Structure formats: C-alpha cells, structure tokens
Ligand binder design. Structure first.
Ligand SMILES: [K+]
Ligand SMILES: [K+]
Ligand SMILES: [K+]
Ligand SMILES: [K+]
Ligand SMILES: [K+]
Ligand SMILES: [K+]
Ligand SMILES: [K+]
Ligand SMILES: [K+]
Ligand SMILES: [K+]
Ligand SMILES: [K+]
Ligand SMILES: [K+]
Ligand SMILES: [K+]
Ligand SMILES: [K+]
Ligand SMILES: [Mg+2]
Ligand SMILES: [Mg+2]
Length: 1336
RNA sequence: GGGGGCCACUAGGGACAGGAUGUUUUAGAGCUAGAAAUAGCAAGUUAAAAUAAGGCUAGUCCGUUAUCAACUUGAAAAAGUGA
DNA sequence: CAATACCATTCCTGTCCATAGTGGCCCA
DNA sequence: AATGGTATTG
C-alpha cells in the first residue's frame, strides 16, 4: 500500500490530500468515540485545516514599552514628592494626599475636595490669578517674591511629568534675540566675500519673515522676494534655505560636479562643510559660519512665538499668548455671532454633539473638526478676515495642550525649571541643596543600550550592575556598568563567525576587514596585452603596488585608473584588457581614508605596529554610539594624537559588522606555509586562490582547522520553526503542516509516503506611500503637491500612485500627463509579464500609451532609453523609482533581454527558490528520511517535491478544473490534491528533473524545454504548428505508465466532485487585551468593568466589551427568586481573558462566586472559540463566544455549477483561443438554466442550515429582479450570494445594489442539547458528545 | 553546485530608550426669573490621577507574541490511544 | 427572547541587530 | 477590515 501526500501551505489554511498510485483519493472507516450511537464514520482522505492568522510581536512590544514608560514617569513624580516631603509637611500636611485622591468622588475623599489649598476661597482665587499652569510657570520664573511651596511643587511637577523630547544633544538658548542683527551680519559676510556682487538687506524685516508662523519654504520665497534679483536658487537663496530644511545642491552655485547638500542638524555637517570648502576654499567658511550664527536665534521660532527679552520663560509666555488670543478672539466671535447670525449661537456654543465651540471644548471635536465646522460660518459673516487668517495658519482659538507640542525640546522645560529653582532656592534651603537632583530627575533617561533595570526576572534585560542596590537617577553611573551593558547590547544580537563559531566577527569598517575584501577581489583580476600568450594573474608585488598607489590614494578605484595610473605608468602598457572587475572595484579602503583625513599621518596608518591600535579604535567607534563613552575608551591613546585629532576622532562613528572573524582572516595559519588567509590573498604564487578556494583546498590546513572548530551545539521542532526568517503568519502554517503530515502517516499504519508535494502561497501602508511621495517631490523641487493636493488613502489607486511617483510626467515619453485623463492612460510592465510575473510598482510604469514602449517582447527600445535615462536618474535620486526599476528600464543599452534571461525567467516561473519553502522541505525531509546506507549516505525513501502555484493554476485553467474561492473552502484541499497529482506525475515522466524539484543533493533549448514541460498532459499541442501526443504517456527508460489521458482525468473529476471534504477550523483559546480600550463614562450597567479595584464603574466609568478566552459548560443549580430556591440549569459561561487565571487556579470557587451551586465538577467542558456542534439535519454551528454562534456547514456545490460560474463570470481571463473562447461562451449560453439551478441549491442549503428566512426572501426577490441583466453580471453577483452560506461569521453582502445585512445567531442555548464534535487536526478522528444527556 | 564573501538596492522580523495627544472622575463658587418645568444670560483654553484588573520574584521588574481537539497514565513535562 | 444600528485610543523621534528578494564581481 | 459586545426597540 503506497501513497503520496499533497500539501498547500497558506497563512490561514493548510490543505492536505492523500493519493494512491492511480491518483485516486482513498476513504476509510474511522472509529468514532463518545456517548452517541455512532461508532464509526466514512472519511475521504482530503481536507483543509483553517486557522486565524498568526500575529507579530509588535503590538505586544508597544504595549510593554508604554507600560514601562508610565511606571517610570510615576517614579519621577515620586522622587520629586520625596524631595518635598518634610518641608511640605510643615506647610500643609495633606497636600500630597489631596493630589493622590483627586480622582475620587467627594463621597470617597478622605480630605477636603479642593486639591491645592483645601478651601474653596483660596482655590477659586488661585484659578482667577492663574487660569492656566503656564501663568503660574511664567510668574514663578520671572518674579522675585517668596512663593507658596505648593505652587512651586505644581510648576516643577508639571515640567517633570511632561518634559519634552530628547532629539537635540547639548544645551540650548545660545542666541535668543538680535536675529535682525544676525541676519544683517550674514548679509554682511556675503557682501564682504562678494564685494563686486553685494546684497542690500536694509529694510528687510527678516525677523517677521523668518520667525513667521508658517512653513520654512514659504518664508524662503518671501525673503527672496524682498531682495532684488537673487533668485531662490541662487547661492544666498540656498544659504537662506540653510536655516530652513533642504539647503539643496550648491553644485549649481559653484559649478562643481558632485552633489552637495548640508543640514545644520545632521552630525555629518562639519564633515560635509569640510568636503565642500576643500572643493571651493576656506574663504567661504565665514559664509556658513555666519549662517550657523543666524540660525541659532531662529531655530526655535516655531515654538517660542514671543520675544526672549521680557521673560526667561518664553515657552510658558507663548502658551499665555495662546490663551490671551483665544480669549480675545472668543469674545469677538461671540459678539459677531450674536450680531450677524444669532440663530446659530446655541448650536455653536451649547451643542456638544455638533462640531462647534461647545463640541470643541466639551465634546469630542478636534481642532481640525472645529476649524472645518466654523470655516463657512466665518466666511458667511463680516469682520472675520483676521480670524480666517488665524484659521488657515492653524492659530485660531488654540488650546495649550495640543497634538503639535511634540517639537518642544526638553531643554526649554529644563530652562524654566532651573529658573524657578534659582528664584526660590533663596527662600527654601532644601531647594538649594536639591537643585541638581531635581534637574537630574527631569534630564535623566535610561540609555537605550542599557535596557530595563531588571534583577534577574526580565527575559528582555541584559544590563549588568557594578553593585547590588536600587538604581536612582542620581547614582546611575555608579551602580550600572554602562560599558559592559553597552557591549552586551550589541553582543547579544551579533553573529559569530560561522567558520570559527567561538570567534566574534570584525567590525564591517575594520581596516583589516577592508584589506581582506580588497585583496580578495584583486587576486582574481587578470590582464592581457599584445606579447602575452595567456592572461595573467597579478603577482603579490603587483597587488601591493596597486594597493599603495591606487587603493591608498583614491576612495574608489576605477578600471580606468587601473589601466592608466598603473599599467601605463608602471608597466608602460598602452593597451591592456582587464577581467575580474568592471567599471570600478567594488571593494575599497574607506576607513583608511577616513582616518587619513582625521589624523593626517599616512606613515602612522601604514605602520603594521599600529594595526592592533587601529583595530581597537574602529572597534570602539563601532561598538559604542555615546560620545562620552567613546571618548573615555579612546582616552588610552590620548598621547598619540593632538587634542584636535582626538576631538575629530571621537566625532566619527561606524555601524555594522562583518561576517568573518579576525582569527579567520589573519589568525589561523596554514601548517606548511605559515601564512594566514590574508597572506595568501596578498601572495599565492601563480594560483592566486581566493577565500573559498583557501578554506576548501585539501592541500592546506584551513579546512581541517575549520572542521575542528565547528561545534553542533538542538532546537525542538517549534523552536526551530520560530527561529526561521519569515512572517509569524506563515510560520504558524508551517508548524500546522508538520503536525498534519504526522497525523496522516499515523492514519496510514505508520507507513511513510512515497512522495510529499508542497506548495506555498505567495505573500497605514498609504502613510508609507505619502511619505515616499513627499520626500521624493521635495527632493525633486517639484510643486506637484502644491498644484495637486492628495491624501494617503487616494494613493491606494495604482495609477495615481504611479502618477505622483513619476512627477506627473510620462515615463516613456517626455511630456506631461493629465490627472483627469488617468483612465485613458496605460500601466505597462517594464520587463513583460509573459516572462516575469511581477505586478508590483517596482516593475510597473504609468505611460500615456504602452505602444510607445516599442516592441512588446522585450524591455523598452533603445530610443526610449536614450530619451529618458536622465529623467529616470532624477527619479532614482528622489527615491521615486528603485535601482532595480531603473536598471530594468535601462537594460536595452546593456544588450536588452538575452535568450538566457528568458530561459531563466520561465524556469523561475516553475522552480521554487524562496528560502522559506526550502526550509519547509528540509524539515519534512529530515523528519521522513532518517536511515543511512552502507556508504553512510542518507537513504531518501520519501521524496519531498516543491512546486510553484503556477503549475497547478495553469493545470486547472487548461483542463477546466476551475476554482472559485468564494463558494466554499474546498479549494485549499483541491489545490493539495492537484499538487500531489501533478508533482508525482511530473517526476515520474522526467526523473532527471529531480535535481530541480526534489530536496536533497542552447539557451533556446532550455527555454523551449521549460516552456513545454507540461505538454505531456495535453493530447494536442499548438506551438509556434500543431503536434499530437499519444493517449497513454509513459516513462522513456523504465516503460512505466505515468498518465492515461482517458481514465485519469475522470479520476481527477471524481475527486474534485466529492462532497465530503474534511474542512476543520482550528479551535483556539482567545488571548490578548482584556477588552476594548475605550475608557467609557459612568453608566448604570453591570457591563462596565472597574479600571481599579476600588473604582466602582457606576461612579467612575471604565471598560466594557471584554473578550472571552473560552466558554465553559456548567451543570449546576442557581438560586431563584426572593426565596433563593435552588433550580437546576445548564448554560455556557464565558470566562474572560481577565478572569481566566482566577478560574483555572480554582474552578469551583470561581463558579460559586459567579452564583452557581453544586457544580458537577466532572461535567465542566472547556469550549474554545470555533467549537463545533451538530444539531438536526446535519446543521452545524461554531462557538463564536459564550452568547453567539457562527455558521458551521460547507455548501458542497457540484462541479458543473462551479465551472459554469467560473466561465460565465469571466473569472480571471478567458482568451486562450478565439474558437475555444467561442466554445466556452456557447456552453455558458446552452446551460443558462444553471442559474436557476444554482439559486435552488443555495435556497435548499439555506433553508436546511442557514435559517435566515428574511434574508433568503430578500435575496430571492433580488435575483428575480435582475433576471434580465446580462449573464456575466448575474453570475458575478451569484458569487456574492455565497456570503450567506459561507462557513464562519455571518457577513453582509450585496446583490447588485441591494444590500443584505448579516443575520446573526445571538443565542447559544440550542447547542447545550446538540452533539459536540471534537476533531483531530485532520478531522478524521472525532469524539462526539451528546449534550442532551446532561441535565439536572 | 539554489552554498560563501563583496558591491548596489529593496522588503520584512526582533529588542530597547523616549515624545505629544486622547480618554475617564474630580477641582476650576455659574447668575438672574420663576414653586418646578423651563427661559434669558454668563462662562469655557487649565490641572491632579489612572492608562490593561493586577502579580511576586518587590526589580525604577513582569502583565496582549508564539503554542492549544478529546481521552488515558500523569503533580506536571510528557508519552500513548482508533482500517 | 429577537432584530438592528453603532462601536472599536491615536500619532511620532532615535539606537541597534539579523534575514532575504533583485541585479552584479569572484569563487566552493 | 471584521466581527463580537452593547444598548435600544419591541
Ligand atoms: K469628604
Ligand atoms: K527677486
Ligand atoms: K474636544
Ligand atoms: K563593479
Ligand atoms: K556605533
Ligand atoms: K596629546
Ligand atoms: K486573535
Ligand atoms: K494566541
Ligand atoms: K466643574
Ligand atoms: K481541533
Ligand atoms: K487619540
Ligand atoms: K520605533
Ligand atoms: K545575489
Ligand atoms: Mg500601573
Ligand atoms: Mg493630559
């Protein structure tokens, strides 16, 4: 008894089938367990496991980190209160108690209800004097009077609890005023450097134009307008853009070739300014210098909208400006609405439901929704011009705690905190002694390279302590080993050397590593001249000379420099042919040139004595990112360099690690020669062996030493699958697949199959699209977003996305495109889809007409390339197209598509090469084949074949075994079946293909062969004339029969027509969040759940809508009526995720607390979601919850109706042949009565199983309404009708324009008397429990 | 040789440190006319506190991923059970 | 009970590691 | 996006 298994692996399904020698599907009697009269059941060996998607760890991580943040913010406030403890006790012994209980209702408050002062008079007076916290902040910053300790606490606590960002390193407020004079001085330095061409900035109000509460680019335009001449793209224009964002290429300004750009915020700024001044002269330094100067007073102008000379609290002053303008404009708006349009006053100022001022202050209306609601009301009235200006600048009636405060750096809050401490430390000594402690509370962050401050109970932590004691912000440097922690941060994530698994890899930018890469590339270079008989390698002396002359004087070495600067200069060759490198060397000594610029001592770099030193420096610069730790670690070399060089040196940093270790590169030595790997790369006689040859050559000891160093370590199956690189979604399917194969082998008497054939399906976002387009267009300098505004959702249209990615132009022709005629344009595949089935934006292009591409059987013609290469390069530099898209677009200037390329593409269409599928194949193969032969080589009893979906897809379409995904879930199982059939047949016919399709170890010819690989199934083949194949197809050598075109197609038809298919929805305990996150207001309802143990929801609000982890069958008694008489019940109790641990720790106590008595402990049945019940007439239901059910039956629609629906709907495309198109159309029209028959099948199924009477009647009327519609559209909507019958949760669907809402099953009472069906993973093994036999 | 190193991209996974909103209860004396219903008017921008209930291992830690038919012997990990 | 309509905390900055898809040089 | 919780209407 031999058999094969077909598998179809998806993100929500694993289809499986078992086939025999004749491509038939067996059927067995399987024993049925339980307490029903049914002892067995006939099962076909085909089906599909269904499951909800596996989820990533992301959401869990975001929640975990936000938790840690709330905990540490609370601890910040706690530190502050601990500082204030005793002196506050002297002033007001219950202030902090009032703060802590501020949330409680007056009934529950232990102290007086007014938090700050504990009496209504003083509290009301406080709020009158200080309407916002920023009033109190500014007063405490500016005033000199002794202030009440409680108000001091309130100001400092507000600064510490909402402390601003940390994106800016260093200290702040160097220049806060005289921006007018700074701008005059920048204009002055420009005029000094260009005495012939000066700029007159007299009268230019640079303050108002540049500190304008508007975008930077707009201010640039205005300022350039004020200066006569001086176009925005001139030198001074880009220098104004310097304080603004882009500061684009000065190459236009200085006529230099390479691209320039600067950004005073980037830490590469000093190096880029050096790189530029080396190209143009240090005399321009004062030009950027002054620029930087003028920037300092203006960089914060967006945040500090008030002069910095009347207050030392410009931020809080700006908030008070917000408040005062809010008040003035509110008075004015109220008066206007009273006068002009008095009927709307109530809707604006009283209606929270509307988006007026009421809904904006008291309702749920946002600033944007309010601006939208009030725009027309302001335009409709008079005297609202200034208010409309403030509205379109987003500065009308602003609150102070707003979504856009995220740009406030922590240094500003710190400045105000320090100012207050300085004012009041004169009166309170404890503020003087704790000034720096409080400042530290504000300024302290745990470094990202330290992680959680755990003590052995966090699986996420790596930090090591210098001593065992509580870490505070003030003793962090002493208790936490920052260096060891920062090291472990990297070393717990980096790979070891695979060849020497106990050796760490080198920094990618190590000098040694780059010597290795350069010599490895260089040793395989060959050259030919005239007198030479044969191309020669480079000798060791030649490689040393090329490294010293070229690689050590140029960052990048081109083949041209090799030919002219070495072979002509040293070898006196006029002509030489180079192989092994094209255009320019890929490897390069970048770090060598970095350190040469920094230290300016070529002899120091070239001295081998300093090798180790340099290796450490780069190591440090790689291992650490914090400037102080880098500095401390380089301190040991402070004696070798000048302080200027030490500063420049600690400035420069590297990221990334190599893949080889130092011991591999320049450590282990060959026994005979005594040479390291690098020594052979530098010189290897006449062989010039490279790295691979070196570690594989049996005449050397490197291979032996690597073998010896290797250690094997073992993961479990689940651990192994978890550690694969793939989506957790597909990993869930992989593990399910292995469990399914295990059960299937158990079903077949523990006999292993002959073949296993596996196919694997191919595998918010609009925000990424909008980001791409914004960046690319502002990098392009285009005004397309100015002239055509767009929202992210709109970019989900392919053509509009392409339009914006193409700067609104045609990509094959130099002309504009029209947004409104997008429907008339074309979307063309760069490399045609007949070769590369790629439908992504990386291979698609928007053009006015695909006809202009040229011939349709290749990449675009050379004319197009010549015309459009520069435009495409612009788009590439804007990151609007990728390098792959650009290269494919330009392939015609590189010979176009060759015949080898087309052969390869067609092979790719058939031979799977994704790593993840290969891992699935390896897993199955290592589980199935476990014995070794006499030569100790693996015995492959089971052949694991992998196929791509296109094989079986083309099969289905060519032999009319059509699939319709919406009818039911049987297509996953059928895919599995057809995979088994096609794979086994394919390798039976052509055994030599095993190398390609089985796991384990003339271009026209392969093109033809792989295009016609599947023709042995067809009876006649039309290929560019008509050829004919026999009725029986056999193997050429063995003579064995592989395919009987008569009987075997009938076998396949019979298998696809079988109604009994084992579809199983995997039952799962629900996990995750306890409930919806919405904190709801107070309500008289027991559905509300307290947010804290003592916060009664009827007084405080809270949560509702909790998630049931799993239901539980309870057979017990419950008290009834005022008498409390015991009454026997049987019902489903939903155990929520939050209740689950309590219920499981002791089920009886939990249930008795819920109200039940005398619980029959042994009749408690755990019922996860999707638990299956059968009732009468085969009607099935699945548990959706403790109080709702899902549809549980599959509609086994016959194959003739399935194929009719496919053909009539024009599912996919029917264009194979004109005459075959005609035959399909004729069959559709001849069998048009199949529409009524299909409606009848749906109706019978619904009346037996679905039981949505009203919905079925509405659907029947809708079908009888559109009987005159074309057959195509009626079929297309009949497809939609199956949403009524599909398995799972009920859903709404549409028949033409009629909408059918979901009919829900909002009661679980009936399943309590039905038959509960427990199913194994395949559903072949069942345990059926009659629940009606359970009762009181 | 579907292994390896390098170059150029692109896409996804994982961890950590931080920012701003939002929400919820309370505080921010509402006034006047009327028995009330209600009407007319005034006012509004701020804060505290919580932000999974909570847990013990008590850390400036942990609490939403992965994994799960039933039954048996099992404390549990497990292993076994049916053409 | 049964049907029906509404509801669902959001967005952002920075540091770092690995894998794997495409094209290319050199090899096992 | 879905689909299970919830209140409202009977
Ligand atoms: K009280
Ligand atoms: K001008
Ligand atoms: K609001
Ligand atoms: K190259
Ligand atoms: K680094
Ligand atoms: K020195
Ligand atoms: K889920
Ligand atoms: K789960
Ligand atoms: K109030
Ligand atoms: K199951
Ligand atoms: K929000
Ligand atoms: K992030
Ligand atoms: K590659
Ligand atoms: Mg907490
Ligand atoms: Mg808040």
């Amino acid at each position: 008894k031999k058999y094969s298994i077909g598998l179809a692996i998806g993100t929500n399904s694993v289809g499986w089938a078992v086939i025999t020698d004749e491509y038939k599907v067996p059927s067995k009697k399987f024993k049925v367990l339980g307490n029903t009269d049914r002892h067995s059941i006939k099962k076909n060996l085909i089906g599909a496991l269904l499951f909800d998607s596996g989820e990533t760890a992301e959401a869990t991580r975001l929640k975990r980190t936000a938790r840690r943040r709330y905990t540490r913010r609370k601890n910040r406030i706690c530190y502050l209160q601990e500082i204030f403890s005793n002196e506050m006790a002297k002033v007001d012994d219950s202030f902090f108690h009032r703060l802590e209980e501020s949330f409680l209702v007056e009934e529950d408050k232990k102290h007086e209800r007014h938090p700050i002062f504990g009496n209504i008079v003083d509290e009301v007076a406080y709020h009158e004097k200080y309407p916002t916290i920023y009033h109190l902040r500014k007063k405490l910053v500016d005033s000199t009077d002794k202030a009440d300790l409680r108000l001091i606490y309130l100001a400092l606590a507000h600064m510490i609890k909402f402390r601003g960002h940390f994106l800016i390193e260093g200290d702040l407020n160097p220049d806060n005023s005289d921006v007018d004079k700074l701008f005059i001085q920048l204009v002055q330095t420009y005029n000094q450097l260009f005495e012939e061409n000066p700029i007159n900035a007299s009268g230019v109000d640079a303050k108002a134009i540049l500190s304008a509460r508007l975008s930077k680019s707009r201010r640039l335009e205005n300022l350039i307008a004020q200066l006569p001449g001086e176009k925005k793209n001139g030198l001074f224009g880009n220098l104004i853009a310097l304080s603004l964002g882009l500061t684009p290429n000065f190459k236009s300004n200085f006529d230099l070739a390479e691209d320039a750009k600067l950004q005073l915020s980037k830490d590469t700024y000093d190096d880029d300014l050096d790189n530029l001044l080396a190209q143009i002269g240090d005399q321009y330094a004062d030009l950027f210098l002054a620029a930087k100067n003028l920037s300092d007073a203006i960089l914060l102008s967006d945040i500090l909208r008030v002069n910095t000379e009347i207050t030392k609290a410009p931020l809080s002053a700006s908030m008070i400006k917000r408040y005062d303008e809010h008040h003035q404009d509110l008075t004015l708006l109220k008066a206007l609405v009273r006068q002009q349009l008095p009927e709307k006053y109530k809707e604006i100022f009283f209606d929270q439901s509307k988006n007026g001022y009421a809904g904006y202050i008291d309702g749920g209306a946002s600033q944007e929704e309010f601006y939208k609601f009030i725009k027309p009301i302001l335009e409709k009235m008079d005297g609202t011009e200034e208010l409309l200006v403030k509205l379109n600048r987003e500065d009308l009636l602003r609150k102070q705690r707003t979504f856009d405060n995220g740009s406030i750096p922590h240094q500003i809050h710190l400045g105000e905190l320090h100012a207050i401490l300085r004012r009041q430390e004169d009166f309170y000594p404890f503020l003087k002694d704790n000034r720096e402690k409080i400042e530290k509370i504000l300024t302290f962050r745990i470094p990202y390279y330290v992680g959680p401050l755990a003590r052995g109970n966090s699986r996420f932590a790596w930090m090591t302590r210098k001593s065992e004691e509580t870490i505070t912000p003030w003793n962090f440097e002493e208790v936490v080993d920052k260096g060891a922690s920062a090291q472990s941060f990297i070393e717990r994530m980096t790979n070891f050397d695979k060849n020497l698994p106990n050796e760490k890899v080198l920094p990618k930018h190590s000098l040694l590593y780059e010597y290795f890469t350069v010599y490895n590339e260089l040793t395989k270079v060959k050259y030919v001249t005239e007198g030479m008989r044969k191309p020669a390698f480079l000798s060791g002396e030649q490689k040393k000379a090329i490294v010293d002359l070229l690689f050590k004087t140029n960052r990048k070495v081109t083949v041209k420099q090799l030919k002219e600067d070495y072979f002509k200069k040293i070898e006196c060759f006029d002509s030489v042919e180079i192989s092994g490198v094209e255009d320019r060397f890929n490897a390069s000594l970048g770090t060598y040139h970095d350190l040469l610029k920094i230290i300016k001592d070529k002899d120091f770099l070239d001295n081998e004595e300093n090798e180790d030193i340099l290796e450490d420096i780069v190591l440090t610069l790689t291992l650490f990112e914090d400037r102080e730790m880098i500095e401390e670690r380089l301190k040991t070399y402070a004696h070798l360099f000048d302080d200027k060089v030490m500063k420049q040196l600690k400035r420069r940093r590297y990221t990334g690690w190599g893949r080889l270790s130092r011991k591999l590169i320049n450590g282990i030595r060959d026994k005979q020669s005594g040479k390291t790997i690098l020594d052979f790369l530098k010189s290897d006689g006449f062989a010039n062996r490279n790295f691979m040859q070196l570690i594989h050559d049996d005449s050397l000891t490197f291979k032996e030493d690597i073998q010896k160093a290797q250690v094997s370590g073992g993961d479990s199956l689940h651990e192994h699958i978890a550690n694969l690189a793939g989506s957790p979604a597909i990993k869930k399917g992989i593990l399910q697949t292995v469990k399914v194969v295990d059960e299937l082998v158990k079903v077949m008497g523990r006999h292993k199959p002959e073949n296993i054939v596996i196919e694997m399906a191919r595998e918010k976002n609009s925000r990424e699209r909008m980001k791409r387009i914004e960046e690319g267009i502002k990098e392009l300098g285009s005004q397309i977003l100015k002239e055509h505004p767009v929202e992210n959702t709109q970019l989900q249209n392919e053509k509009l996305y392409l339009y914006y990615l193409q700067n609104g132009r045609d990509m094959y022709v130099d002309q504009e495109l029209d947004i409104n005629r997008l429907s008339d344009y074309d979307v063309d595949a760069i490399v045609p889809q007949s070769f590369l089935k790629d439908d992504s934006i990386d291979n698609k292009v928007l053009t006015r007409s695909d006809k202009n591409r040229g011939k349709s059987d290749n990449v675009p013609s050379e004319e197009v390339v010549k015309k459009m290469k520069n435009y495409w390069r612009q788009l590439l530099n804007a990151k609007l197209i990728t390098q792959r898209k650009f290269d494919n677009l330009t392939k015609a200037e590189r010979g176009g598509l060759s015949e080898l390329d087309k052969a390869g593409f067609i092979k790719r269409q058939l031979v799977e090469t994704r790593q993840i599928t290969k891992h699935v194949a390896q897993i199955l193969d290592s589980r199935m084949n476990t014995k070794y032969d006499e030569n100790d080589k693996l015995i492959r009893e089971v052949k694991v074949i992998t196929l791509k979906s296109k094989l079986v897809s083309d099969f289905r379409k060519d032999f009319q075994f059509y699939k319709v995904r919406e009818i039911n879930n049987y297509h996953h199982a059928h895919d599995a079946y057809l995979n088994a059939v096609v794979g086994t047949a394919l390798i039976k016919k052509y055994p030599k293909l095993e190398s390609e399709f089985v796991y384990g170890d003339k271009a026209t010819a392969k093109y033809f062969f792989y295009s016609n690989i599947m023709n042995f199934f067809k009876t006649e083949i039309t290929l560019a004339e008509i050829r004919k194949r026999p009725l029986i197809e056999t193997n050429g050598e063995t003579g064995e029969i592989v395919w009987d075109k008569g009987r075997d197609f009938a076998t396949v038809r019979k298998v696809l027509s079988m109604p009994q298919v084992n579809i199983v929805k995997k039952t799962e305990v629900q996990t995750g969040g306890f409930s919806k996150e919405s904190i709801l207001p107070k309500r008289n309802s027991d559905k509300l759940i307290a947010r804290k143990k003592d916060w009664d929801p009827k007084k405080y609000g809270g949560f509702d809508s909790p998630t049931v982890a799993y239901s539980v069958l309870v057979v017990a008694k419950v008290e009834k009526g005022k008498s409390k008489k015991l009454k026997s019940v049987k019902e489903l109790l939903g155990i929520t995720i939050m209740e689950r641990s309590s219920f499981e720790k002791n089920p009886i106590d939990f249930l008795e607390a819920k109200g039940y008595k005398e619980v029959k402990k042994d009749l408690i049945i755990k019922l996860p979601k999707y638990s299956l019940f059968e009732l009468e007439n085969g009607r099935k239901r699945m548990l959706a919850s403790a109080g709702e059910l899902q549809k549980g039956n599959e509609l086994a629609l016959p194959s003739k109706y399935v194929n009719f629906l496919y053909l009539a709907s024009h599912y996919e495309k029917l264009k194979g042949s004109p005459e075959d198109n005609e035959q399909k159309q004729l069959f559709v029209e001849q069998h048009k009565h199949y529409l009524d028959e299909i409606i009848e099948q749906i109706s019978e199924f619904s009346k037996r199983v679905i039981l949505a009477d009203a919905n079925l009647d509405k659907v029947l009327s809708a079908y009888n309404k559109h009987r005159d519609k074309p057959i195509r559209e009626q079929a297309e909507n009949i497809i939609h009708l199956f949403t009524l019958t599909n398995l799972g949760a009920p859903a709404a669907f549409k028949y033409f324009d009629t909408t059918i809402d979901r009919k829900r099953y909002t009661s679980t009472k009936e399943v309590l008397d039905a038959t509960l069906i427990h199913q194994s993973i395949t559903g072949l093994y069942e345990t059926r429990i009659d629940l009606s036999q359970l009762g009181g």
